[PDB]
Design a protein around this ligand. Sequence first.
Ligand SMILES: C[C@]12C[C@@]34CCC(=O)[C@@](C)(CCC(=O)Nc5c(O)ccc(C(=O)O)c5O)[C@@H]3[C@H](C[C@@H]1C4)O2
Ligand SMILES: C[C@]12C[C@@]34CCC(=O)[C@@](C)(CCC(=O)Nc5c(O)ccc(C(=O)O)c5O)[C@@H]3[C@H](C[C@@H]1C4)O2
Lengths: 411, 411
Amino acid sequence: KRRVVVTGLGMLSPVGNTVESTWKALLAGQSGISLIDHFDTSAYATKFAGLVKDFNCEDIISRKEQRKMDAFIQYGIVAGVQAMQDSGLEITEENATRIGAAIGSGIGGLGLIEENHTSLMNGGPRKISPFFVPSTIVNMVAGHLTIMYGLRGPSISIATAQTSGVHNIGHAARIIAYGDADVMVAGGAEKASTPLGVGGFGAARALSTRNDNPQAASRPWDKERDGFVLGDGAGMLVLEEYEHAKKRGAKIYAELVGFGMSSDAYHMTSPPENGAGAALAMANALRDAGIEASQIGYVNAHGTSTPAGDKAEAQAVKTIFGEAASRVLVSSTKSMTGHLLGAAGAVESIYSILALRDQAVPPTINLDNPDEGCDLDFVPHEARQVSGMEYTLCNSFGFGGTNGSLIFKKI
Amino acid sequence: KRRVVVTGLGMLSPVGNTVESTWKALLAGQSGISLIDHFDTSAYATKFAGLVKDFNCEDIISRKEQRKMDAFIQYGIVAGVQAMQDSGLEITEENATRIGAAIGSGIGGLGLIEENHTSLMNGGPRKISPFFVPSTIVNMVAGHLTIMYGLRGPSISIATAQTSGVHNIGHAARIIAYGDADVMVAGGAEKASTPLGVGGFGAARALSTRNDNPQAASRPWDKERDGFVLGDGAGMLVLEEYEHAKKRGAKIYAELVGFGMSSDAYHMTSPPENGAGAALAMANALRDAGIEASQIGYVNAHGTSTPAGDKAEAQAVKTIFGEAASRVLVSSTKSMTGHLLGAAGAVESIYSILALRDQAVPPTINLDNPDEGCDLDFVPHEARQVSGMEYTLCNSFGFGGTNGSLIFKKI
Ligand SMILES: C[C@]12C[C@@]34CCC(=O)[C@@](C)(CCC(=O)Nc5c(O)ccc(C(=O)O)c5O)[C@@H]3[C@H](C[C@@H]1C4)O2
Ligand SMILES: C[C@]12C[C@@]34CCC(=O)[C@@](C)(CCC(=O)Nc5c(O)ccc(C(=O)O)c5O)[C@@H]3[C@H](C[C@@H]1C4)O2
């Protein structure tokens, strides 16, 4: 029986370029949402997003190497390096074979897709870059990282849209527990704040359109919600088999105890009002962790700020928690962070970890008027102190009715 | 201890729109490569590909629904339906929760990406389709299928480039054996024969350029190789837990016994001359299946027809088989099929299955002059009869040094 633990964290987000800076901001209820400036937004109904401020990889990636990779890859590599370094793990010829990675993304390299496509339109296939494929495809973050570190263990990339972060972490853990690896860098990366990303989700009427106050747009469970907010970033965890960790005197953030998946079997871009899909994923994580819903101190909701999605998760929470529905704290950091799609579940797994270490839960900001008929503690406006919280649960849901949940335990 | 078996197959390929028609063609050494006609290839260095002839889904997908999906999705759904039907499985409210899917793709919806991007360039974000996201992203095949069949079990989508087919099947099996599901539709779909796909891999100098004889271009291990051949299609298997299968009187094609993954940690678009990555994946599949390299009757190689890739796999084969290197048959169906990237490992898992049922191995066509210094039986030109073959092994490798292998056992 092999237990899995988190021994390293890395992160790039709209509120901080490091793990600690990001957590500090979240507990302080800060928003990382700002107006888009890197492309003309005149014709765009949505003109803001949660961007990564002052990104720098000069010391991690050569501009020679930078040319062969989309922003999403650069972000993921940086965050993955941060995590590898934070873990203290030393790759040796003994090790190599037993260390891998499970890193995905929702949409991948849109920015370079647009660039290459624009080039082809203007001057033919002759203008497409030799790096088109390798610089845009989803598995490129695991690709570069394995190379940078000489990792020869299993490497996979789960592209399950907005549910990727959770899936990659879940399966990385599965890969470890199963015996295929001893250590795994896992998580996701995304950079979809481009004409296509913004134009695309905007075309589906999925984005908040509150340009007059970009910072108040992400408002999960609030009566005035008008769609999700797009956020860029990457989040990475180094997962390791318990004994392998101890034996090397690794610092252990927390333990990965449960992982559950489910399918909505309902609609391509929406969940059922009843949240039956979300309920199953959560129900599966508990059964996997062998605990009861009553033991969860906090839930880092998927809470995207869409009219239909927020209601469904709330429904699902009432269903799984029932009695304790009022005693469990639920909050959506997307209220500050925005929605980082393929990286959401990753960064949000980190917040679920830190909430355990620091016995502090971050707030769902902008919750001025919650929906009516809801008995839930959405941790509105301000961070909240907690006492004997041993477990946290993290949800991620995605287009295609794909759901996943991770349960983390203190120590 | 939960064993996994194949109880259903579905497939669309360049040589047939069904499982059986495709196998018949392969054993008859037929090529499905032809000249591209759906887009002007004048400026293109590569002007041919392995296309799906006369695709029809009218009876499976409404043109109303067809509008919201890229060719890659349509292909995958059709092949997935074929597999579901072939299995005889009846989804009930008891079942639903325990049936899922693991289906990926290498690049996804290029054709609709180009369409939406072209539209945006010509008339702004106003022209982007509300279905941009849902119609192009990789997890959309699992999405539609789970919905079409009321599947509520776990659903994931592994995007590991040219290695996806194998990964999805591997993990679907893992998901089943672990206890998270009883049945899984698994495999991959791809349709990258577009200006971007052809222009893209062509820009990296990865494609055969033999337009004077499209049918002779895919030539694995042949001295005159000049790069891989692009092929479209989808391949799907219904994996099921042994007892669950029997209990319902399921027809059982074969059993999934081993699955191994590895990372090259070498180059973004190329393997090491020594094929150490491929060796590890194969070495891991055997250890997983608990058998010895000598027990493998046939290897369905990754064999893409690139100068460097073919040499590396051969090296890896010599390494793992050693003594038996000469007694094992290795063949690359891509010599006829082309390279279907994310779907390669899927369709090729089917051929590895059928080679067991039918004790017949398909040929590596176009092998007029093999490389020098190679003791291997590449099953050149003609299919080959086999006697007591109990196991077959299937390899898939991809950009980012991501490798995987599946081992199948007779009965
Ligand atoms: C056809 C419609 C119904 C519509 C009703 C009003 C809504 O509320 C939204 C805006 C989104 C529903 C939803 O929450 N989808 C959803 C989801 O299933 C899973 C994940 C996420 C995520 O962002 O991770 C997500 O966004 C839907 C979307 C756009 C169109 C308007 O589909
Ligand atoms: C920088 C270069 C070196 C170069 C040397 C000559 C070659 O032989 C090729 C054409 C491809 C090497 C290769 O086999 N890559 C490779 C791989 O690692 C994994 C999977 C596949 C697949 O198709 O599933 C694949 O194609 C390479 C490519 C293009 C450029 C020319 O990279």
